[PDB]
């Protein structure tokens, strides 16, 4: 990002950042196994992969 | 396709709970509307308003 004068270097570095907020944003998940409720279902979640 | 068929499941499991009682909870909930309808004097509708 810090390329400046350079067009290129620019926008890759906002779609690098695009990425990285997908990353960040599904994080969230694991933060909140830790209720009652939406606990056992994120857990039951992934258990789903090999199907 | 993945997290809609989850909810295809938790649906489905769900229901193999609260069936077996479901019967019960819907004639524990039978005495409420019982109750409300026996507990008034009551006349048709329309002309409660005359009451």
Known sequence: ?51 | ILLVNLLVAMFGYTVGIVQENNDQVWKFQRYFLVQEYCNRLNIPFPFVVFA
């Open chain 1, 1 to 51: 990002r810090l390329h400046s004068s350079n067009k290129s270097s620019l926008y890759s570095g906002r779609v690098i950042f695009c990425l990285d907020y997908i990353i960040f944003t599904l994080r969230l998940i694991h933060i909140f196994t830790v209720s009652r409720n939406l606990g056992p279902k994120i857990i039951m979640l992934q258990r789903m992969l090999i199907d």
